[PDB]
Amino acid sequence: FMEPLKVEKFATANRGNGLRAVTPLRPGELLFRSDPLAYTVCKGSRGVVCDRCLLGKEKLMRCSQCRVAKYCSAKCQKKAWPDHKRECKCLKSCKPRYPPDSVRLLGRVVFKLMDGAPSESEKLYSFYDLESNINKLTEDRKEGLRQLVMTFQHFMREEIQDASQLPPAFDLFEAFAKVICNSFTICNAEMQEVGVGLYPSISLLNHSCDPNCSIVFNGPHLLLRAVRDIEVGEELTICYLDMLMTSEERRKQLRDQYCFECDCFRCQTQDKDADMLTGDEQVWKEVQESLKKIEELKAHWKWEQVLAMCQAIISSNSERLPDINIYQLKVLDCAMDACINLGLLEEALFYGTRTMEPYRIFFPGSHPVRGVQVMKVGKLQLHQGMFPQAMKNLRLAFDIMRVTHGREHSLIEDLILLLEECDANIRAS
Amino acid sequence: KFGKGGTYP
Ligand SMILES: Nc1ncnc2c1ncn2[C@@H]1O[C@H](CSCC[C@H](N)C(=O)O)[C@@H](O)[C@H]1O
Ligand SMILES: [Zn+2]
Ligand SMILES: [Zn+2]
Ligand SMILES: [Zn+2]
């Protein structure tokens, strides 16, 4: 009921500020929970999940005024009103255009800065403390930031007309630099992207391709946990990137977006790069290309389109391109997720099983994305009466997620129940 | 896009 702060801000040798433990930490230990300073649904999910709680409830009611924001209840619509009142007229005026996520997010940020009532999200680090990397920014990035600025000014014109209507310390250009640099993709239960937010305190964490911490979201609520034994004074790290990336791809996105090159052992040794790019470049690069179109359809929840593209690609390469190739792998993943959202459970189990061994290799021992994946496969097996396999995978998912999601998490509750149902049928038959 | 975490299209 009164757990003490187990982490603290500190200055690193080279990585700027960071976060480190003040006490020894066990895997699964909760380090920090934070509400966002500000957050918003991402473009692809507007109208599919509740603007407030980010859950994908079946039937949503749109805000009468703007008909852009949608809510799962009067409760959520009311609770979100402080975050929505200053943007509503802006969204109405914008139609049929919709602003970029960063512009809508920042639009929420500026009013929260005036709050005056201390934000629990800024307990260790404020919005103004956030790194902007302005000195390191390329000219190409600065031009883009300038565009975001002008877009902001147009999008907000009904509510903000001059710099004097915002705090003086605030600077719009530097703000977008910070947003690009410090924002978090908010994922749901099934590890789907549903939103984006600023979590200034959490933003203290520096990057590693081999992190000692993981993050999982409870709606907009962010939970930070250790995923292995951490010593006193040891820097806490998370992974800014998708795990299914070559060391070259990671080096590029960390540079273009975060203005630094990673020096972790995985990046110094090109760890697992070979396996990732298994197969002939002439073959998998077509897949890599298609992946863009597919991921955009997935973001917009177009599962029928996603499935169509995937099984086309999948069947087309079955004779020459192995599942462990990360681009092929991603397609199998998308295919699986699509089948699940379309009730095609047997087909889902087919694609999902094929992701299992590659996921074990490419993901660390305890990673939330792997855990949830293993959970889905076990469930799909359970639904097909393949009890002993299901039992194996359900146990594994529990083993992982009790560390990544924590025991108190709702998915653990389902998991336990599934474990019982499954372990019964074993002794029974 | 942008944001710490999230898939890589
Ligand atoms: N592994 C790493 N090595 C060097 N710099 C890193 C790093 N991980 C993160 N950073 C730096 O930290 C930024 C991410 S926000 C992390 C906290 C920040 N360094 C601060 O002092 O407030 C990146 O833009 C990058 O400049
Ligand atoms: Zn809601
Ligand atoms: Zn509205
Ligand atoms: Zn690295």
mmCIF file of all heavy atoms in Angstrom, chain A residues 61-92:
data_model
loop_
_atom_site.group_PDB
_atom_site.id
_atom_site.type_symbol
_atom_site.label_atom_id
_atom_site.label_comp_id
_atom_site.label_asym_id
_atom_site.label_seq_id
_atom_site.Cartn_x
_atom_site.Cartn_y
_atom_site.Cartn_z
ATOM 1 N N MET A 61 -20.115 5.426 -28.837
ATOM 2 C CA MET A 61 -20.925 6.606 -29.106
ATOM 3 C C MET A 61 -20.039 7.804 -29.411
ATOM 4 O O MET A 61 -19.136 8.130 -28.645
ATOM 5 C CB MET A 61 -21.849 6.912 -27.926
ATOM 6 C CG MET A 61 -21.189 6.844 -26.571
ATOM 7 S SD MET A 61 -22.320 7.325 -25.253
ATOM 8 C CE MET A 61 -22.530 5.775 -24.376
ATOM 9 N N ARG A 62 -20.289 8.456 -30.540
ATOM 10 C CA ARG A 62 -19.456 9.574 -30.944
ATOM 11 C C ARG A 62 -19.878 10.838 -30.221
ATOM 12 O O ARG A 62 -21.046 11.002 -29.879
ATOM 13 C CB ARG A 62 -19.512 9.771 -32.464
ATOM 14 C CG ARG A 62 -20.906 9.774 -33.055
ATOM 15 C CD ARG A 62 -21.070 8.700 -34.140
ATOM 16 N NE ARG A 62 -20.845 9.205 -35.496
ATOM 17 C CZ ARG A 62 -21.723 9.928 -36.194
ATOM 18 N NH1 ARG A 62 -22.900 10.261 -35.670
ATOM 19 N NH2 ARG A 62 -21.421 10.332 -37.422
ATOM 20 N N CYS A 63 -18.907 11.711 -29.961
ATOM 21 C CA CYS A 63 -19.168 13.038 -29.414
ATOM 22 C C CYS A 63 -20.073 13.814 -30.364
ATOM 23 O O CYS A 63 -19.761 13.962 -31.544
ATOM 24 C CB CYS A 63 -17.852 13.792 -29.186
ATOM 25 S SG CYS A 63 -18.011 15.579 -28.935
ATOM 26 N N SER A 64 -21.197 14.300 -29.851
ATOM 27 C CA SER A 64 -22.208 14.931 -30.692
ATOM 28 C C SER A 64 -21.645 16.103 -31.482
ATOM 29 O O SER A 64 -22.059 16.357 -32.610
ATOM 30 C CB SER A 64 -23.386 15.404 -29.843
ATOM 31 O OG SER A 64 -22.969 16.408 -28.938
ATOM 32 N N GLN A 65 -20.685 16.799 -30.886
ATOM 33 C CA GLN A 65 -20.171 18.030 -31.461
ATOM 34 C C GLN A 65 -19.217 17.797 -32.623
ATOM 35 O O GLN A 65 -19.422 18.330 -33.710
ATOM 36 C CB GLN A 65 -19.478 18.859 -30.382
ATOM 37 C CG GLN A 65 -20.422 19.347 -29.294
ATOM 38 C CD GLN A 65 -21.562 20.183 -29.849
ATOM 39 O OE1 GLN A 65 -21.369 21.342 -30.220
ATOM 40 N NE2 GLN A 65 -22.754 19.596 -29.919
ATOM 41 N N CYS A 66 -18.174 17.008 -32.407
ATOM 42 C CA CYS A 66 -17.160 16.844 -33.444
ATOM 43 C C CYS A 66 -17.337 15.556 -34.247
ATOM 44 O O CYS A 66 -16.884 15.465 -35.388
ATOM 45 C CB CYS A 66 -15.760 16.883 -32.826
ATOM 46 S SG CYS A 66 -15.408 15.533 -31.685
ATOM 47 N N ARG A 67 -17.993 14.573 -33.636
ATOM 48 C CA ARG A 67 -18.189 13.248 -34.223
ATOM 49 C C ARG A 67 -16.872 12.616 -34.673
ATOM 50 O O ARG A 67 -16.835 11.831 -35.618
ATOM 51 C CB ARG A 67 -19.190 13.322 -35.380
ATOM 52 C CG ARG A 67 -20.605 13.599 -34.886
ATOM 53 C CD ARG A 67 -21.672 13.469 -35.960
ATOM 54 N NE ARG A 67 -22.993 13.329 -35.352
ATOM 55 C CZ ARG A 67 -23.693 14.334 -34.829
ATOM 56 N NH1 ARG A 67 -23.205 15.565 -34.842
ATOM 57 N NH2 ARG A 67 -24.883 14.106 -34.291
ATOM 58 N N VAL A 68 -15.796 12.952 -33.964
ATOM 59 C CA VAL A 68 -14.486 12.350 -34.201
ATOM 60 C C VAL A 68 -14.103 11.470 -33.014
ATOM 61 O O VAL A 68 -13.793 10.288 -33.164
ATOM 62 C CB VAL A 68 -13.395 13.409 -34.415
ATOM 63 C CG1 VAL A 68 -12.033 12.742 -34.547
ATOM 64 C CG2 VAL A 68 -13.709 14.259 -35.636
ATOM 65 N N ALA A 69 -14.131 12.063 -31.829
ATOM 66 C CA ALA A 69 -13.919 11.326 -30.599
ATOM 67 C C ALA A 69 -15.084 10.373 -30.347
ATOM 68 O O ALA A 69 -16.248 10.757 -30.473
ATOM 69 C CB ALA A 69 -13.750 12.286 -29.434
ATOM 70 N N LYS A 70 -14.769 9.128 -30.002
ATOM 71 C CA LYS A 70 -15.788 8.139 -29.665
ATOM 72 C C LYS A 70 -15.496 7.520 -28.300
ATOM 73 O O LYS A 70 -14.333 7.337 -27.939
ATOM 74 C CB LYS A 70 -15.865 7.053 -30.738
ATOM 75 C CG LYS A 70 -16.236 7.561 -32.126
ATOM 76 C CD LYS A 70 -16.767 6.420 -32.988
ATOM 77 C CE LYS A 70 -16.966 6.838 -34.439
ATOM 78 N NZ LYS A 70 -17.310 5.669 -35.306
ATOM 79 N N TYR A 71 -16.550 7.209 -27.544
ATOM 80 C CA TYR A 71 -16.397 6.731 -26.171
ATOM 81 C C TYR A 71 -17.212 5.474 -25.899
ATOM 82 O O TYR A 71 -18.205 5.205 -26.576
ATOM 83 C CB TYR A 71 -16.794 7.827 -25.181
ATOM 84 C CG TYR A 71 -15.970 9.080 -25.329
ATOM 85 C CD1 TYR A 71 -16.461 10.183 -26.016
ATOM 86 C CD2 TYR A 71 -14.691 9.152 -24.800
ATOM 87 C CE1 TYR A 71 -15.699 11.327 -26.164
ATOM 88 C CE2 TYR A 71 -13.925 10.285 -24.941
ATOM 89 C CZ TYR A 71 -14.430 11.371 -25.624
ATOM 90 O OH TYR A 71 -13.659 12.501 -25.758
ATOM 91 N N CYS A 72 -16.790 4.714 -24.894
ATOM 92 C CA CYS A 72 -17.432 3.448 -24.563
ATOM 93 C C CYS A 72 -18.568 3.626 -23.561
ATOM 94 O O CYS A 72 -19.343 2.701 -23.324
ATOM 95 C CB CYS A 72 -16.404 2.459 -24.002
ATOM 96 S SG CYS A 72 -15.953 2.750 -22.274
ATOM 97 N N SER A 73 -18.661 4.810 -22.968
ATOM 98 C CA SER A 73 -19.658 5.067 -21.937
ATOM 99 C C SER A 73 -19.761 6.549 -21.654
ATOM 100 O O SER A 73 -18.930 7.335 -22.113
ATOM 101 C CB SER A 73 -19.306 4.328 -20.645
ATOM 102 O OG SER A 73 -18.123 4.861 -20.073
ATOM 103 N N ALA A 74 -20.777 6.931 -20.890
ATOM 104 C CA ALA A 74 -20.894 8.312 -20.446
ATOM 105 C C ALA A 74 -19.729 8.621 -19.526
ATOM 106 O O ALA A 74 -19.173 9.721 -19.551
ATOM 107 C CB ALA A 74 -22.213 8.547 -19.738
ATOM 108 N N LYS A 75 -19.370 7.628 -18.719
ATOM 109 C CA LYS A 75 -18.256 7.740 -17.796
ATOM 110 C C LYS A 75 -16.997 8.181 -18.522
ATOM 111 O O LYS A 75 -16.395 9.194 -18.169
ATOM 112 C CB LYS A 75 -18.011 6.410 -17.085
ATOM 113 C CG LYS A 75 -16.859 6.436 -16.090
ATOM 114 C CD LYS A 75 -16.306 5.034 -15.854
ATOM 115 C CE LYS A 75 -15.133 5.043 -14.884
ATOM 116 N NZ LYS A 75 -15.545 5.443 -13.511
ATOM 117 N N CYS A 76 -16.608 7.429 -19.548
ATOM 118 C CA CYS A 76 -15.395 7.749 -20.292
ATOM 119 C C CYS A 76 -15.503 9.099 -20.993
ATOM 120 O O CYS A 76 -14.555 9.882 -20.973
ATOM 121 C CB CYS A 76 -15.076 6.647 -21.305
ATOM 122 S SG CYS A 76 -14.175 5.228 -20.610
ATOM 123 N N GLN A 77 -16.659 9.376 -21.593
ATOM 124 C CA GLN A 77 -16.876 10.646 -22.287
ATOM 125 C C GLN A 77 -16.744 11.821 -21.326
ATOM 126 O O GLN A 77 -16.176 12.856 -21.670
ATOM 127 C CB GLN A 77 -18.249 10.677 -22.963
ATOM 128 C CG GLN A 77 -18.517 11.967 -23.745
ATOM 129 C CD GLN A 77 -19.773 11.902 -24.607
ATOM 130 O OE1 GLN A 77 -20.521 10.927 -24.565
ATOM 131 N NE2 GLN A 77 -20.002 12.943 -25.397
ATOM 132 N N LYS A 78 -17.260 11.653 -20.116
ATOM 133 C CA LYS A 78 -17.133 12.680 -19.094
ATOM 134 C C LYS A 78 -15.678 12.833 -18.649
ATOM 135 O O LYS A 78 -15.131 13.936 -18.668
ATOM 136 C CB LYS A 78 -18.027 12.354 -17.896
ATOM 137 C CG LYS A 78 -18.199 13.503 -16.918
ATOM 138 C CD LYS A 78 -19.147 13.125 -15.784
ATOM 139 C CE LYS A 78 -19.260 14.247 -14.753
ATOM 140 N NZ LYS A 78 -20.105 13.868 -13.582
ATOM 141 N N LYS A 79 -15.054 11.725 -18.260
ATOM 142 C CA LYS A 79 -13.675 11.743 -17.774
ATOM 143 C C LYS A 79 -12.702 12.334 -18.789
ATOM 144 O O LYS A 79 -11.678 12.902 -18.417
ATOM 145 C CB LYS A 79 -13.213 10.330 -17.399
ATOM 146 C CG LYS A 79 -13.885 9.733 -16.175
ATOM 147 C CD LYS A 79 -13.735 10.637 -14.960
ATOM 148 C CE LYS A 79 -13.781 9.841 -13.663
ATOM 149 N NZ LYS A 79 -14.857 8.811 -13.672
ATOM 150 N N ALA A 80 -13.018 12.197 -20.072
ATOM 151 C CA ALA A 80 -12.114 12.658 -21.118
ATOM 152 C C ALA A 80 -12.366 14.114 -21.493
ATOM 153 O O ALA A 80 -11.580 14.717 -22.221
ATOM 154 C CB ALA A 80 -12.237 11.778 -22.339
ATOM 155 N N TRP A 81 -13.462 14.674 -20.992
ATOM 156 C CA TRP A 81 -13.849 16.039 -21.342
ATOM 157 C C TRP A 81 -12.767 17.109 -21.095
ATOM 158 O O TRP A 81 -12.594 18.005 -21.925
ATOM 159 C CB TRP A 81 -15.130 16.431 -20.599
ATOM 160 C CG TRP A 81 -15.596 17.799 -20.954
ATOM 161 C CD1 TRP A 81 -15.644 18.886 -20.136
ATOM 162 C CD2 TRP A 81 -16.050 18.241 -22.237
ATOM 163 N NE1 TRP A 81 -16.115 19.976 -20.827
ATOM 164 C CE2 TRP A 81 -16.370 19.604 -22.120
ATOM 165 C CE3 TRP A 81 -16.222 17.612 -23.473
ATOM 166 C CZ2 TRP A 81 -16.851 20.350 -23.188
ATOM 167 C CZ3 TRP A 81 -16.700 18.355 -24.533
ATOM 168 C CH2 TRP A 81 -17.009 19.709 -24.385
ATOM 169 N N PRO A 82 -12.041 17.034 -19.963
ATOM 170 C CA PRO A 82 -10.949 18.003 -19.810
ATOM 171 C C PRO A 82 -9.888 17.898 -20.905
ATOM 172 O O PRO A 82 -9.238 18.888 -21.235
ATOM 173 C CB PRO A 82 -10.348 17.636 -18.450
ATOM 174 C CG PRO A 82 -11.459 17.009 -17.711
ATOM 175 C CD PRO A 82 -12.249 16.255 -18.728
ATOM 176 N N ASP A 83 -9.719 16.705 -21.460
ATOM 177 C CA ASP A 83 -8.716 16.490 -22.490
ATOM 178 C C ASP A 83 -9.271 16.801 -23.873
ATOM 179 O O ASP A 83 -8.516 17.032 -24.823
ATOM 180 C CB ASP A 83 -8.202 15.051 -22.436
ATOM 181 C CG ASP A 83 -7.559 14.712 -21.101
ATOM 182 O OD1 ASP A 83 -6.894 15.595 -20.516
ATOM 183 O OD2 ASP A 83 -7.717 13.562 -20.634
ATOM 184 N N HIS A 84 -10.595 16.822 -23.984
ATOM 185 C CA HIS A 84 -11.230 16.931 -25.290
ATOM 186 C C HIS A 84 -11.834 18.303 -25.579
ATOM 187 O O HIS A 84 -11.980 18.677 -26.741
ATOM 188 C CB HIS A 84 -12.315 15.859 -25.435
ATOM 189 C CG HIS A 84 -13.029 15.898 -26.751
ATOM 190 N ND1 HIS A 84 -12.372 15.784 -27.958
ATOM 191 C CD2 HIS A 84 -14.341 16.050 -27.048
ATOM 192 C CE1 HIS A 84 -13.250 15.861 -28.943
ATOM 193 N NE2 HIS A 84 -14.451 16.023 -28.418
ATOM 194 N N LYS A 85 -12.179 19.058 -24.540
ATOM 195 C CA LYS A 85 -12.934 20.292 -24.747
ATOM 196 C C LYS A 85 -12.177 21.303 -25.607
ATOM 197 O O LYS A 85 -12.773 21.978 -26.446
ATOM 198 C CB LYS A 85 -13.328 20.921 -23.405
ATOM 199 C CG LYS A 85 -12.177 21.344 -22.515
ATOM 200 C CD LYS A 85 -12.701 21.970 -21.222
ATOM 201 C CE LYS A 85 -13.708 23.090 -21.511
ATOM 202 N NZ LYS A 85 -14.301 23.692 -20.272
ATOM 203 N N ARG A 86 -10.864 21.381 -25.429
ATOM 204 C CA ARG A 86 -10.065 22.338 -26.183
ATOM 205 C C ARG A 86 -9.733 21.841 -27.590
ATOM 206 O O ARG A 86 -9.223 22.602 -28.405
ATOM 207 C CB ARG A 86 -8.766 22.662 -25.441
ATOM 208 C CG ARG A 86 -8.929 23.180 -24.016
ATOM 209 C CD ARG A 86 -9.829 24.404 -23.959
ATOM 210 N NE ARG A 86 -9.310 25.530 -24.737
ATOM 211 C CZ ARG A 86 -8.676 26.577 -24.215
ATOM 212 N NH1 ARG A 86 -8.474 26.648 -22.905
ATOM 213 N NH2 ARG A 86 -8.242 27.556 -25.003
ATOM 214 N N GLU A 87 -10.005 20.572 -27.883
ATOM 215 C CA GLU A 87 -9.665 20.034 -29.202
ATOM 216 C C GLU A 87 -10.901 19.779 -30.069
ATOM 217 O O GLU A 87 -10.800 19.656 -31.290
ATOM 218 C CB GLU A 87 -8.849 18.740 -29.062
ATOM 219 C CG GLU A 87 -9.645 17.545 -28.555
ATOM 220 C CD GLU A 87 -8.833 16.258 -28.496
ATOM 221 O OE1 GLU A 87 -7.702 16.226 -29.032
ATOM 222 O OE2 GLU A 87 -9.331 15.275 -27.906
ATOM 223 N N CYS A 88 -12.064 19.715 -29.433
ATOM 224 C CA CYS A 88 -13.302 19.353 -30.117
ATOM 225 C C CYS A 88 -13.581 20.228 -31.331
ATOM 226 O O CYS A 88 -13.718 19.732 -32.447
ATOM 227 C CB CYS A 88 -14.476 19.430 -29.147
ATOM 228 S SG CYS A 88 -15.949 18.623 -29.746
ATOM 229 N N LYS A 89 -13.655 21.534 -31.105
ATOM 230 C CA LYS A 89 -13.909 22.484 -32.176
ATOM 231 C C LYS A 89 -12.810 22.421 -33.231
ATOM 232 O O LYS A 89 -13.070 22.622 -34.414
ATOM 233 C CB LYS A 89 -14.032 23.894 -31.605
ATOM 234 C CG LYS A 89 -14.947 23.953 -30.389
ATOM 235 C CD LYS A 89 -15.283 25.376 -29.966
ATOM 236 C CE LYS A 89 -16.305 25.368 -28.838
ATOM 237 N NZ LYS A 89 -16.745 26.734 -28.458
ATOM 238 N N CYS A 90 -11.587 22.122 -32.801
ATOM 239 C CA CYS A 90 -10.466 21.973 -33.726
ATOM 240 C C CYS A 90 -10.648 20.775 -34.652
ATOM 241 O O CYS A 90 -10.347 20.852 -35.844
ATOM 242 C CB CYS A 90 -9.155 21.829 -32.961
ATOM 243 S SG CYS A 90 -8.728 23.260 -31.970
ATOM 244 N N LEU A 91 -11.136 19.671 -34.093
ATOM 245 C CA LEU A 91 -11.385 18.465 -34.870
ATOM 246 C C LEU A 91 -12.561 18.649 -35.822
ATOM 247 O O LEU A 91 -12.555 18.125 -36.936
ATOM 248 C CB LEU A 91 -11.642 17.274 -33.949
ATOM 249 C CG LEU A 91 -10.413 16.690 -33.258
ATOM 250 C CD1 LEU A 91 -10.809 15.583 -32.299
ATOM 251 C CD2 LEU A 91 -9.427 16.177 -34.290
ATOM 252 N N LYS A 92 -13.572 19.391 -35.379
ATOM 253 C CA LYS A 92 -14.727 19.669 -36.221
ATOM 254 C C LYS A 92 -14.305 20.507 -37.426
ATOM 255 O O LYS A 92 -14.649 20.195 -38.566
ATOM 256 C CB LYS A 92 -15.815 20.386 -35.421
ATOM 257 C CG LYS A 92 -17.135 20.563 -36.154
ATOM 258 C CD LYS A 92 -18.091 21.421 -35.338
ATOM 259 C CE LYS A 92 -19.385 21.699 -36.090
ATOM 260 N NZ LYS A 92 -20.226 20.478 -36.260
#
